[PDB]
Design an enzyme around this catalytic site. Structure first.
Site, mmCIF file in Angstrom:
data_model
loop_
_atom_site.group_PDB
_atom_site.id
_atom_site.type_symbol
_atom_site.label_atom_id
_atom_site.label_comp_id
_atom_site.label_asym_id
_atom_site.label_seq_id
_atom_site.Cartn_x
_atom_site.Cartn_y
_atom_site.Cartn_z
ATOM 1 C CE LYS E 9 18.997 -36.451 7.473
ATOM 2 N NZ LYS E 9 18.480 -37.074 7.278
ATOM 3 C CG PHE E 57 24.106 -38.302 -3.449
ATOM 4 C CD1 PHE E 57 24.293 -37.749 -4.239
ATOM 5 C CD2 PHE E 57 23.950 -38.109 -2.088
ATOM 6 C CE1 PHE E 57 24.097 -36.023 -3.796
ATOM 7 C CE2 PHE E 57 23.654 -36.845 -1.200
ATOM 8 C CZ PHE E 57 23.535 -36.086 -2.485
ATOM 9 N NE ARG E 85 10.530 -46.394 11.074
ATOM 10 C CZ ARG E 85 11.127 -46.948 12.553
ATOM 11 N NH1 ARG E 85 11.862 -46.537 13.355
ATOM 12 N NH2 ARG E 85 9.938 -48.331 13.050
ATOM 13 C CB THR E 91 13.348 -41.403 3.255
ATOM 14 O OG1 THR E 91 13.559 -42.751 5.309
ATOM 15 C CG2 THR E 91 14.425 -40.778 3.304
ATOM 16 N NE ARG E 102 12.829 -36.554 6.715
ATOM 17 C CZ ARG E 102 12.747 -38.244 7.390
ATOM 18 N NH1 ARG E 102 11.615 -38.809 7.108
ATOM 19 N NH2 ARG E 102 13.885 -38.042 7.911
ATOM 20 C CD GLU E 126 21.186 -44.311 14.205
ATOM 21 O OE1 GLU E 126 19.904 -43.174 14.350
ATOM 22 O OE2 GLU E 126 20.641 -44.992 13.498
#
Lengths: 149, 149, 149, 149, 149, 148
Positions: E9, E57, E85, E91, E102, E126
């Protein structure tokens, strides 16, 4: 043994390079005698850069050096002032070899991430200015005899 | 292809530098022909440094080389002996460039973490002295064709 | 202190993982007591996996373990067999454990880069099999008192 | 600000050096303007190496450059073409300083893992050749004012 | 073999995490099948987020998902989708283990540096959305036989 | 939100300052304060005042005098709890590979780092080890890329 003053400048700190810069010095066998994150006054930075009061970039330098916190360090070892200058690389990072700090991290002379003393005698002057003598740590390195003869 | 001899010296082993020095040879593309942690005898180290029997540092060099275990190695590839020296750096770490083993990890010439063959000639001898034929491994590198033309 | 046997399997050596794998144990503060790059016999390998002599894995597992050279190691420290297994990760490199060796480097249970003793008993056995007493080095880690209470 | 063309050659890609090569340019503070994995045509590669059509290595170079996919990149910053040249290091890896990409990763000139433009005018042509304008990302670098003066 | 879709991202790109994130996939033994830096429209994300457009949101999310370039990737190998993952981590970064992307680099769920497919059939949808079939490279991994049985 | 982190004498003597610092920089936490100091035993007795009654107290204080300590304040959302996850379990043998103690330590008494146990704990440790002049007030260059 010999001492030298290294500062990480505001760009070095804001770009997340405190740890890698300290590592390159630890890894070499140099001993960390002092360390602080500080926000020094403009008087303090005018004293530090006194030999540049004369020049025309000096007010830009001072005001950028005010622009965020700095990490002031003392490193100790044989020939550490001169070996420090080699680790940091040329003042202009475009002239610095890869594997030096400025050679791996910097582009512009005015965002060269790090300051180092240019002589033994200028180091003592900078250490006395940035640190009260009580901030200097007196200990022997766990591996002194594996690092030195 | 050509072979060179590289030893991590007692200081190198005792400072946790065995992994980092192997990584620098692996990553370049050189092949690991032989490897061991060993405690050579005074007699072996006196034969290894034979060309320096003359000199006044020779006894003290031998003693320090006995002062703890040594990782002996053989690296194989095109001009591995010459490139071997570039990677290690100048025998005096303070003459050595950042990027090199001595430039990253060492200060004193008497604690320069690593010994390397001075020539293809001496490499052939240092390999015979330190390793039996049983211990030299014969295999093709998984990535030979990507590493060489 | 306690000991464990660890071997980098032939996938491990051919993928350039010797350096990184040695680093992981070095950095934790385990002492390297033995190290060798060796190409076992088939009877050697047969006797190393003797508990699984009948089971169906065996003749295929053995032929792969012959496909190239292996780095045998002994590592020494407090609880080093159990901490040895934690660092390797689960046998199936779908470990579910990034930060371990298999979880960072491996995919297939049959290409899981390294072998580690399942037990103190089995390590003592495996160390005797792979190493001669002469090859077990007796020395004090330079930083023993900073690593242990 | 100045743009330059870097390609990771098929050896670079096949040896797992995409991550490490990308990190060296990121860490210096250069902006990634464009990136892709592509397999270019023989005709693409021949126009890329146009000024060496007359040299004896040309036909091998093209076939090698066809032997697997290439990561093509545009990096953007002050003096990035010249600095990019220094980071990649000498064309012949054995003339290359450790701390450069070729100095750490490459042995043979015919497997020197990476291509960089030889000039600003040259780089513009290479960027035009490998990317259509829609693949060039325009955006300000989050750290612009800490990298430049 | 199987393919998953991994995007870095804009927080990932602007924080200089492209190189490190690519390395964790390369070092595990997964094969880069596609790579590109792109800036998608609010059409080419409309249906990407056909499972994630309308929460409570997301006037914040789609504003931020074209605040900068995205690096879009396809990775290939046995179980690359569930392993992917695992590598990215939970997440929500604050429930991610150190060792995960992360877990090492992120804090906020809204700046979680990375997206990956939630299943093997989602990956294909995707992949076909982000890439033309001619961007997916088809080639045999150099080390396939050392990574897989 | 702030937390207190101290690299212990062993952490310093084994050359882990740079590594420990980067694990925090990399996660996106900001460095509010840093210094290399040698605290008085009276300082340390107050730091560990909650273990004044425990058998191992004089031996803890004694060990913690055996050379300089690097004291740090790191700032960010849930930094005390995420501080605890990065450091790993107090016992390094109970600690995940990838945590600081999981990668670098073995014995509880040589566990290289100390973290606050609580936001409340942290506030007391920060107030003890640093005067308010030493806490650096600045916005993180990458704030909007780290937090919504």
């Amino acid at each position: 043994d010999e001492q030298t003053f290294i500062a990480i400048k505001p760009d070095g700190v804001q770009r997340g390079l405190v740890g890698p810069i300290i590592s390159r010095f630890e890894n070499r066998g140099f001993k960390l005698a002092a360390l602080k994150l500080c926000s020094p006054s403009k008087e303090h930075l005018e004293q530090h850069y006194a030999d540049l009061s004369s020049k025309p970039f000096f007010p830009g330098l001072v005001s950028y050096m005010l622009s965020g916190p700095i990490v002031a360090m003392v490193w100790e070892g044989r020939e550490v002032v001169k070996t420090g200058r080699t680790i940091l690389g040329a003042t202009n990072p475009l002239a610095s070899a890869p594997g030096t700090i400025r050679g791996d991290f910097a582009i512009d002379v005015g965002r060269n991430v790090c300051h180092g003393s240019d002589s033994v005698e200028n180091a003592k002057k900078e250490i006395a200015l940035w640190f009260k003598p009580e901030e200097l740590q007196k200990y022997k390195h766990s591996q002194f005899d594996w690092i030195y003869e």
